[PDB]
Amino acid sequence: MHRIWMGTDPHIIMSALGSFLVGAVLVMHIWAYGQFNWPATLKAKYATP
Amino acid sequence: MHRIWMGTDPHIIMSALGSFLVGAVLVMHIWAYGQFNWPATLKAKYATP
Amino acid sequence: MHRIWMGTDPHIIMSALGSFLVGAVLVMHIWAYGQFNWPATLKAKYATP
Amino acid sequence: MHRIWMGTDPHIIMSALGSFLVGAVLVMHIWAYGQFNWPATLKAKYATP
Amino acid sequence: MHRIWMGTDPHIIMSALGSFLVGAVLVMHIWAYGQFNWPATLKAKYATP
Amino acid sequence: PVNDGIWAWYGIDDDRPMAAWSRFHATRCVEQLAINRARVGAAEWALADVQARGIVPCIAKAAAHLARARAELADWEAQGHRLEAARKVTPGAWTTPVI
Amino acid sequence: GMTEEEARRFHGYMVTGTLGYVVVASVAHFLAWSWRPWF
Amino acid sequence: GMTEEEARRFHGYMVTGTLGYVVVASVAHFLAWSWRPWF
Amino acid sequence: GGMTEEEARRFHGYMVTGTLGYVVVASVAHFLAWSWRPWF
Amino acid sequence: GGMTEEEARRFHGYMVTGTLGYVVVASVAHFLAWSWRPWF
Amino acid sequence: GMTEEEARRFHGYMVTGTLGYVVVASVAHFLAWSWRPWF
Amino acid sequence: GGMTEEEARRFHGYMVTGTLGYVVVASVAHFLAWSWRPWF
Amino acid sequence: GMTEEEARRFHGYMVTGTLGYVVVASVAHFLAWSWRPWF
Amino acid sequence: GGMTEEEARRFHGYMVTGTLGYVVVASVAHFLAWSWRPWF
Amino acid sequence: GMTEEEARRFHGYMVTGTLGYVVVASVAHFLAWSWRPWF
Amino acid sequence: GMTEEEARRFHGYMVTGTLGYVVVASVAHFLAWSWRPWF
Amino acid sequence: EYQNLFTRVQVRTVPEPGIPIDESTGTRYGTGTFSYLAGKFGDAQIGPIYLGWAGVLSLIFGFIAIEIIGLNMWASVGWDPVEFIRQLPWLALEPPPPQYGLRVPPLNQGGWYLMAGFFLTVSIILWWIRIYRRARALQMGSHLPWAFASAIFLYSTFFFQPLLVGSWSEMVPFGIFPHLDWTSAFSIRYGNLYYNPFHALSIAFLYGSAVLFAMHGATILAVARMGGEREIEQITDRGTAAERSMLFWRWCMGFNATMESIHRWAWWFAVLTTFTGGIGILLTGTVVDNWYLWGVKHGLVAPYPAQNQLTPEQQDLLRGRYQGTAPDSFPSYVV
Amino acid sequence: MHRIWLMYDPRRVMVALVGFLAVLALVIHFVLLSSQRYSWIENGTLGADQAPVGASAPAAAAEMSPLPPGR
Amino acid sequence: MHRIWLMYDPRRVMVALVGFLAVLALVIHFVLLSSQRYSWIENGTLGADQAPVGASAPAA
Amino acid sequence: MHRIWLMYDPRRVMVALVGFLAVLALVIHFVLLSSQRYSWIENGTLGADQAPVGASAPAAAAEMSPLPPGR
Amino acid sequence: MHRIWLMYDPRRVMVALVGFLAVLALVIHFVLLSSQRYSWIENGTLGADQAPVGASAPAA
Amino acid sequence: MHRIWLMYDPRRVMVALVGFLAVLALVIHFVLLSSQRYSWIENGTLGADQAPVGASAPAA
Numbered sequence A, B, C, D, E: 001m002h003r004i005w006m007g008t009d010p011h012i013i014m015s016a017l018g019s020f021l022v023g024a025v026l027v028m029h030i031w032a033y034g035q036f037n038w039p040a041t042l043k044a045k046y047a048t049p
Numbered sequence F: 001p002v003n004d005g006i007w008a009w010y011g012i013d014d015d016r017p018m019a020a021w022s023r024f025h026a027t028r029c030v031e032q033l034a035i036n037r038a039r040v041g042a043a044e045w046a047l048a049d050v051q052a053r054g055i056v057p058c059i060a061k062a063a064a065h066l067a068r069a070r071a072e073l074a075d076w077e078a079q080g081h082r083l084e085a086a087r088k089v090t091p092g093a094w095t096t097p098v099i
Numbered sequence G, H, K, M, O, P: 001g002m003t004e005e006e007a008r009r010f011h012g013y014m015v016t017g018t019l020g021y022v023v024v025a026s027v028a029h030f031l032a033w034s035w036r037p038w039f
Numbered sequence I, J, L, N: 001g002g003m004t005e006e007e008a009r010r011f012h013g014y015m016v017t018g019t020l021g022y023v024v025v026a027s028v029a030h031f032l033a034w035s036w037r038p039w040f
Numbered sequence Q: 001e002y003q004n005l006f007t008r009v010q011v012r013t014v015p016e017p018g019i020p021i022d023e024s025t026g027t028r029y030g031t032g033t034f035s036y037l038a039g040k041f042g043d044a045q046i047g048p049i050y051l052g053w054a055g056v057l058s059l060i061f062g063f064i065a066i067e068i069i070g071l072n073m074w075a076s077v078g079w080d081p082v083e084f085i086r087q088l089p090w091l092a093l094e095p096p097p098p099q100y101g102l103r104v105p106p107l108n109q110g111g112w113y114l115m116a117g118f119f120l121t122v123s124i125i126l127w128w129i130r131i132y133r134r135a136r137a138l139q140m141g142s143h144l145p146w147a148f149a150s151a152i153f154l155y156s157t158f159f160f161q162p163l164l165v166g167s168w169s170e171m172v173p174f175g176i177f178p179h180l181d182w183t184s185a186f187s188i189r190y191g192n193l194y195y196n197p198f199h200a201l202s203i204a205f206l207y208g209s210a211v212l213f214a215m216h217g218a219t220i221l222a223v224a225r226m227g228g229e230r231e232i233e234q235i236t237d238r239g240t241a242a243e244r245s246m247l248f249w250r251w252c253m254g255f256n257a258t259m260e261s262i263h264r265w266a267w268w269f270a271v272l273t274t275f276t277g278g279i280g281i282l283l284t285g286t287v288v289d290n291w292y293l294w295g296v297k298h299g300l301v302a303p304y305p306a307q308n309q310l311t312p313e314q315q316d317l318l319r320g321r322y323q324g325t326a327p328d329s330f331p332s333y334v335v
Numbered sequence R, T: 001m002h003r004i005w006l007m008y009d010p011r012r013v014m015v016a017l018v019g020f021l022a023v024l025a026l027v028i029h030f031v032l033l034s035s036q037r038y039s040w041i042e043n044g045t046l047g048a049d050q051a052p053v054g055a056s057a058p059a060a061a062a063e064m065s066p067l068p069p070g071r
Numbered sequence S, U, V: 001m002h003r004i005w006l007m008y009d010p011r012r013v014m015v016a017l018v019g020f021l022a023v024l025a026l027v028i029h030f031v032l033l034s035s036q037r038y039s040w041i042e043n044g045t046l047g048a049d050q051a052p053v054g055a056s057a058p059a060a
């Protein structure tokens, strides 16, 4: 399966994968903060009475 | 795993990493100050009536 | 670790570092003067009624 | 530590330092006059009613 | 200590110092006349009703 | 820039000195070598004509122009040698030589 | 571009990184599921 | 004349400057978002 | 141009050391933060 | 026209230092403007 | 253009005239401030 | 060219010493600040 | 620019001027503190 | 080519003398002013 | 013009760039549709 | 282009004429101020 | 096919013209220079100018006129330099109030206007003299100063028609949009200037000037490859470029000019634009006060069906008054 | 299908492509920004149900007209 | 990927890029400055709850 | 990074830079000077709590039913 | 750093400087003269307490 | 300082100086003549205690 990487460039591949992971993780967290009501429960816990 | 550095320049690496860390740390603090009630509770402690 | 400075110009390093410190220190004092209510309590101490 | 001066010009270093001190001192006094209520108490002492 | 003057022109130095002294003296007098209520008390001593 | 013209605004510039292989710079170089050799030929013909009719201030300028044409040609010959060296060491480059 | 032996060496690390990343994320989801299950 | 070494050297700075520029802009956007969200 | 493998091996050792140091200091920071204001 | 790498390195020393010094002055100007009348 | 000696000689006057100009401007501003402050 | 290995080796020693000096002074500053107006 | 011996001379005066300035400023702050203490 | 070392050393003696003479006259002025209208 | 090898090598980049760009645009539309659908 | 001594001669006139004009304008302002002060 | 619309190869000459033809008194000011941008479209030399006594005085008188206008405009926004640039096209220096007639008005109510108008007029006359002297010094015919005299004639009618109707208030305000406001209100006051026959004629020559220069410009460019732009040599030593130019127009519209005489058609069309214009202005308000009614009298006005019909009591009710003076008080209405 | 490129300078193709995308992107953004529904700088914080929707009908009183009378 | 700098002159692409970023930045700042929501020079000190919002649908 | 000055004539760079900074500085001052909050020549002596602020979103009902100003 | 005058012809710089300073000085003076507070030709003899101030926020 | 006249032609500088000063003098006189306080052709005889000031009368 390694034979897919021949003819490619490691730094280009790692840049493309790294930019993907940054974007996916950020999209997933900002989505998840909307659904799970966190950190909104954290903010309410320490908020001023 | 060091071979990833071959053909790179250390100053290019340290500037890229240095940028990323400065950005991440700033975003994390600005975020945290809105979730945790701080410095807002610090400010309220020493505020004038 | 000293090898990181090889090929640099020491005046550019000191210029960059000194400029970062000035801006960081200024931002910190604006911020701290806000949260800690000082010199606001100093001004009130010596103000004329 | 004296090697930091190698390649520099004394008249640039003195000009830059002197300009900094002039600015810093004037900023500090005009700030301090605002906080300490002086010369305001001096002016009040000799004011004509 | 004298060596700082090397490569300068004494006419330049005496112009620069002379300008600074004229400036600083005038600013100090403009300021002092505000704080010390003088010549305002002198003018009142001889004013016609 | 006379050759790339408007495309120099977008950073196409095939005249600039090049030492890696580049088929675009090699193309420009082969075109400009022919033009400049013809231009050197015309410049030295014009000197021969104006020497024959003997007009002194014109002979001076014709020689000055010829020297400039030789110098502008020599720059393209230098570019041709750089690219031809790079051709021999680079896979998939041209089979016909530059210069 | 990259040769067949360099690709072999690349592939070993790439699989190692991928499996490590998935393992950590698996722990993260086990924790998240314990804290706030989503079905 | 320009070598492939010079091209690779220049490309490193170009990538680094692009990344640093994107970092600063990302902090600027998050500051603006914290101040006044546009969604 | 750029780092040789012998430089890359040397550079990697410091990069790992700094990264682990930074993570250790951040781990202390989070232990203090959790002791002060738990977030879950 | 010529421009050697030592001339470029000498020029870079001034161009960076002048740039940073100007940004430092501007930073004090913003420090003064903010303490007079904050915009956020 | 200039010799370096001409540049040295010129620069001293240029610095002096700039400093003289700034001195007069500083007095002009403090007169104006004492007459009618803008902050 | 740029700074040599041996210049860098001694530059580093002063850079470290200067940095530690700054951090020591900042430590006294924070200790005095905490005595005066603690923030947690 | 300055040679290593010129830099050694120049540094000695810089240290001296800086410390003397800080001494005078320290006396000023002691006087200011005795007059209108700010904490 | 500007002031030599021997010129600079001679110039420095007048500069020091004039500066001290100015400070002396200013000290008298401040003594008189203090006795006239003290400011602290 | 260019050898068949170069037109093929170029076509590989053009196809890949087009599809990578269309993927990023697909996510942008996924986000826009989540925020304010237009049908 | 003047000789250095010839520029020196012109400079003498030029400075003196300038200061003479400033002197006349100073007296004009003394008269204007006495007639109708603007501060 | 090459269009000859811009020059891909310019040539420099190191010595230059611009040192004039033998010219006698006055002085050549500056040294000649080349603009590469000027060289793209036309001849590249940007270079020395001649003034003499009349040119110097014209610039002095004209500069004062420009200063008076600008200073009044700038005063009219309270010396605000931002509003001076922001509002510039709406600013004016405005003629005197109508009640003064031809008498001298107050300084801020048209006195500056008449001053600026006077110095501008003197400056224009001195410029005409400067051009006249220069044409003769270069040993040329006097065609250009008489062409310029036609423009000056129209300009002078913006003084003489206000003089003839008896009030400086009727003059044109100095200002970009304000002088267009005057241009519209002039046509309104005098009952639609389209029916002024000299205005109609002036338009016929203004349009004809564009027709001729489009035709002549295109014609010469169309034969420029055959040397047709060397017009003086085509006049003294007719070439095939001139013959083809004559045959084109002959075969197109049945008659043709010559390479010389087309420049007379050009000269008279331009000159008659402003000459007929000036006559129309001078007739307005002095001989005819409503040009539409003059059109009705002389049969110019096409009939349309009536859009409304008045009854006799409406004819008395709907007459207004002529506009009078503005109210010089702020009435209270309380009782 | 790659033989399409043999006719073209690839540098010029890329400059042609980038210019096309830049214009198209700006046109689509300015169209949306000029709409009511997607005027996101003013109204981006509205929820999807709160955002404007074009009228399924207009309405009037019988004596009203948007346009003046005339032939 | 660095081979594009043999295809294109770095000296000329850099100038074009700096120009493009300057124009785009100024356009976006002035678009925001002209809006109600982001007229930050006049209203920057308002809290996010207090800042203007473009009118909603009447939901009727 | 210094090799950027091998690539560009520094005489051209510095002139372009100073021209850019001058125009930017002018623009920012004149933008501020035309605002109400930072009309500093007229209102610079006001304290920050007294300086103008651009108006909020309305009172949340966004609706009218008033009572007169007192006579 | 007098060698600045080697890369830039001071004959050009001093003309550019004086032109800039002249125009900027005039702009500042006319901006002030146009303002209410600093209209010194009409109102320069008023004292600092009598000089105009631009309007505050309405609650102030 | 006299070497300024080597760097610049004094024949050019004096004409520029004369032109600048004449225009500046003309502008300043026009500005003053345009004011109320210094409308000296109409009001120069008034005397300083009854010359105009740019303020509104107290109690209207």
Ligand code: BCL
Binding pocket: C011, C012, C014, C015, C016, C017, C018, C019, C021, C022, D004, D005, D008, D013, D016, D017, D020, J017, J020, J021, J022, J024, L018, L022, M011, M014, M015, M018
């Ligand atoms: C060629 C010389 C080097 C240089 C060499 C040094 C040295 C050596 C020291 C500093 C230090 C400082 N530098 Mg540095 N620094 C340079 C350029 C800069 C620039 C800039 C815009 O380029 C800035 C903002 C700074 C800023 C600063 C401060 C953060 C810091 C405290 C002193 C101070 O306030 O100086 C403000 C000054 C300016 C804004 C301009 C003039 C710079 C002068 C040369 C600074 C050093 C002189 C000063 C008297 C201290 C010397 C003490 C020694 C015991 C003799 N430097 C140049 C490039 N800098 C000190 C430090 O780290 O303290 C903890 C220190 O000891």
Ligand SMILES: CC[C@H]1c2cc3[nH]c4c(c3C)C(=O)[C@H](C(=O)OC)c4c3nc(cc4[nH]c(cc(n2)[C@@H]1C)c(C(C)=O)c4C)[C@@H](C)[C@@H]3CCC(=O)OC/C=C(\C)CCC[C@H](C)CCC[C@H](C)CCCC(C)C
Binding pocket: Q056, Q058, Q059, Q060, Q061, Q062, Q063, Q066, Q123, Q124, Q127, Q128, Q131, Q144, Q147, Q148, Q150, Q151, Q270, Q271, Q273, Q274
């Ligand atoms: C045949 C009719 C057409 C016509 C023709 C025409 N106009 C002409 C001519 C001709 C044939 C000229 O020869 C003449 C000319 O010079 O052309 C270049 C002119 C002219 N047509 C002009 C304008 C003009 N023509 C117009 C129209 C028309 N011109 C008609 C369409 C219009 C319109 C449509 O509104 C305008 C605005 C002028 C460009 C010019 C006459 C120039 C003139 O008289 O200038 C007088 C001078 C001034 C106003 C002062 C300028 C002040 C400087 C800026 C000051 C600088 C400082 C100075 C150096 C200070 C002094 C110091 C001293 C010590 C030196």
Ligand SMILES: COC(C)(C)C/C=C/C(C)=C/C=C/C(C=O)=C/C=C/C(C)=C/C=C/C=C(C)/C=C/C=C(\C)CC/C=C(C)/C=C/C=C(\C)C(=O)O
Binding pocket: A010, A024, A028, A031, B001, B003, B004, G006, G009, G010, G013, G014, G016, G017, G018, G021
């Ligand atoms: C919420 O609603 C919606 C959004 C709809 C929900 C749905 C979301 C969906 C569908 C998500 C899908 C996600 C996904 C899909 O697959 C996610 C896929 C994730 C993946 C693939 C992760 C892989 C990570 C791999 C890593 C970290 C590798 C690291 C490698 C390292 C460190 C080695 C580096 C060094 C090298 C190489 C050099 C070696 C030596 C060399 C070369 C030498 O010596 O020469």
Ligand SMILES: COC(C)(C)C/C=C/C(C)=C/C=C/C(C=O)=C/C=C/C(C)=C/C=C/C=C(C)/C=C/C=C(\C)CC/C=C(C)/C=C/C=C(\C)C(=O)O
Binding pocket: H006, H009, H010, H013, H014, H016, H017, H018, H021, R025, R026, R029, R030, R033, S021, S024, S027, S028, S031, T001, T003, T004, T007
């Ligand atoms: C109203 O709203 C509307 C407008 C309607 C909404 C829509 C908006 C839209 C559609 C926006 C689109 C934006 C966009 C799209 O792509 C935006 C894309 C932006 C991009 C790509 C930015 C890239 C920036 C890169 C930078 C800064 C790089 C800097 C590099 C530096 C500093 C190093 C230089 C080299 C050096 C120093 C070394 C020399 C060495 C040499 C020579 C040697 O060593 O030899």
Ligand SMILES: COC(C)(C)C/C=C/C(C)=C/C=C/C(C=O)=C/C=C/C(C)=C/C=C/C=C(C)/C=C/C=C(\C)CC/C=C(C)/C=C/C=C(\C)C(=O)O
Binding pocket: A025, A026, A029, A030, B010, B024, B027, B028, B031, C001, C003, C004, I007, I010, I011, I014, I015, I017, I018, I019, I022
């Ligand atoms: C709040 O909501 C949201 C935001 C959504 C929440 C989620 C946030 C998320 C997802 C965060 C993710 C963060 C993250 C992800 O990876 C974070 C990753 C962080 C990392 C990697 C940190 C690494 C730091 C490394 C450092 C400091 C190294 C220092 C090295 C030093 C000092 C040595 C220098 C000297 C050398 C090298 C020697 C030269 C020798 C030479 C040249 C020679 O010898 O020749």
Ligand SMILES: COC(C)(C)C/C=C/C(C)=C/C=C/C(C=O)=C/C=C/C(C)=C/C=C/C=C(C)/C=C/C=C(\C)CC/C=C(C)/C=C/C=C(\C)C(=O)O
Binding pocket: J010, J011, J014, J015, J017, J018, J019, J020, J022, S022, S025, S026, S029, S030, S033, T014, T017, T021, T024, T027, T028, T031, U001, U002, U003, U004, U007
């Ligand atoms: C309010 O609404 C809107 C307005 C819309 C919001 C705004 C929006 C935007 C988009 C703002 C953008 C800002 C911006 C973006 O980049 C701003 C960027 C600014 C920058 C980079 C500034 C850089 C300044 C650098 C300077 C001054 C350098 C000085 C150099 C000196 C002094 C050196 C002298 C010595 C030399 C030369 C050497 C001689 C040779 C010697 C000695 C030898 O050879 O020996």
Ligand SMILES: COC(C)(C)C/C=C/C(C)=C/C=C/C(C=O)=C/C=C/C(C)=C/C=C/C=C(C)/C=C/C=C(\C)CC/C=C(C)/C=C/C=C(\C)C(=O)O
Binding pocket: K006, K009, K010, K013, K014, K015, K016, K017, K018, K021, T022, T025, T026, T029, T030, T033, U021, U024, U027, U028, U031, V001, V002, V003, V004, V007
């Ligand atoms: C309404 O408010 C808004 C406008 C909105 C607010 C905003 C305002 C803004 C943005 C302001 C910005 C200001 C600014 C910068 O930008 C301001 C910059 C100011 C500067 C740099 C001033 C410098 C002056 C220097 C002078 C005068 C030098 C004179 C030198 C002389 C006389 C000597 C000449 C040489 C001689 C005699 C020797 C010859 C020898 C020779 C030849 C030899 O020896 O050979």
Ligand SMILES: COC(C)(C)C/C=C/C(C)=C/C=C/C(C=O)=C/C=C/C(C)=C/C=C/C=C(C)/C=C/C=C(\C)CC/C=C(C)/C=C/C=C(\C)C(=O)O
Binding pocket: B025, B026, B029, B030, C010, C028, C031, D001, D002, D003, D004, L007, L010, L011, L012, L014, L015, L017, L018, L019, L022
């Ligand atoms: C409020 O809310 C928010 C903002 C969010 C809160 C959060 C804030 C955050 C996250 C802050 C983070 C701060 C930070 C992080 O790292 C801060 C880091 C600061 C640092 C690194 C400081 C370093 C200082 C170093 C100094 C002073 C060194 C001086 C050296 C000197 C004087 C010696 C000079 C001579 C040398 C070198 C040799 C000469 C040459 C020789 C011999 C030769 O050439 O041979």
Ligand SMILES: COC(C)(C)C/C=C/C(C)=C/C=C/C(C=O)=C/C=C/C(C)=C/C=C/C=C(C)/C=C/C=C(\C)CC/C=C(C)/C=C/C=C(\C)C(=O)O
Binding pocket: C025, C026, C029, C030, D010, D017, D024, D028, D031, E001, E003, E004, M006, M009, M010, M013, M014, M016, M017, M018, M021
């Ligand atoms: C209010 O709120 C906010 C503002 C936020 C509050 C905070 C404010 C802050 C942070 C302020 C400042 C902090 C600071 C930080 O470091 C301040 C730093 C101050 C410093 C460093 C002062 C240094 C002074 C040095 C002097 C006087 C040196 C004089 C040298 C002389 C006289 C010698 C001359 C002769 C020579 C050289 C000849 C040599 C021989 C030669 C050449 C030969 O022989 O050849």
Ligand SMILES: COC(C)(C)C/C=C/C(C)=C/C=C/C(C=O)=C/C=C/C(C)=C/C=C/C=C(C)/C=C/C=C(\C)CC/C=C(C)/C=C/C=C(\C)C(=O)O
Binding pocket: D025, D026, D029, D030, E010, E014, E021, E024, E027, E028, E031, N007, N010, N011, N014, N015, N017, N018, N019, N022
């Ligand atoms: C009100 O609120 C605020 C304003 C905030 C309050 C705060 C104010 C502050 C901070 C003030 C600070 C002031 C200050 C700080 O240092 C002030 C410093 C002042 C100084 C240094 C004065 C020095 C004067 C020196 C003089 C007069 C020298 C004269 C020399 C003469 C006559 C000799 C002539 C002969 C020569 C030369 C020989 C030629 C021989 C030759 C050539 C040969 O022989 O070759």
Ligand SMILES: COC(C)(C)C/C=C/C(C)=C/C=C/C(C=O)=C/C=C/C(C)=C/C=C/C=C(C)/C=C/C=C(\C)CC/C=C(C)/C=C/C=C(\C)C(=O)O
Binding pocket: O013, O014, O016, O017, O018, O021, R014, R017, R024, R027, R028, R031, S001, S003, S004
């Ligand atoms: C009124 O209705 C309205 C509102 C208007 C609505 C309707 C709108 C309508 C009708 C829209 C239509 C849109 C449309 C229709 O076709 C749109 C079509 C769009 C298309 C085709 C997009 C294609 C994008 C392709 C890209 C990005 C490719 C990038 C390629 C790259 C990155 C490779 C670079 C590699 C190189 C250089 C080699 C380096 C390696 C080297 C050198 C090596 O290895 O050596």
Ligand SMILES: COC(C)(C)C/C=C/C(C)=C/C=C/C(C)=C/C=C/C(C)=C/C=C\C=C(C)\C=C\C=C(C)\C=C\C=C(C)\C=C\CC(C)(C)OC
Binding pocket: Q066, Q067, Q069, Q070, Q071, Q074, Q114, Q115, Q116, Q117, Q118, Q121, Q155, Q156, Q158, Q159, Q171, Q172, Q173, Q174, Q175, Q176, Q179, V027
């Ligand atoms: C400091 O310098 C500054 C910055 C102020 C310089 C800048 C100046 C600026 C910005 C100037 C701007 C000028 C503009 C925009 C002018 C626009 C002019 C326009 C569009 C004019 C258009 C038409 C004007 C006409 C037709 C005027 C004709 C006037 C005539 C014919 C007047 C004749 C008057 C006579 C003969 C007066 C005789 C005097 C006597 C005593 C006999 O009175 C009748």
Ligand SMILES: CCCCCCCCCCCCO[C@@H]1O[C@H](CO)[C@@H](O[C@H]2O[C@H](CO)[C@@H](O)[C@H](O)[C@H]2O)[C@H](O)[C@H]1O
Binding pocket: P008, P009, P011, P012, P013, P016, P017, P018, P020, P021, P024
């Ligand atoms: C526009 C209003 C101007 C009002 C002017 C008021 C009068 C000013 C002139 C005062 C006359 C005396 O002033 C003095 O004249 C002499 C010549 O006599 C000038 O002398 C100048 O030329 C002579 C040779 O002729 C040189 O040797 C000398 O070095 C040079 O300075 C002086 O530079 C000037 O200072």
Ligand SMILES: [Fe+3]
Binding pocket: Q216, Q220, Q231
């Ligand atoms: Fe013709």
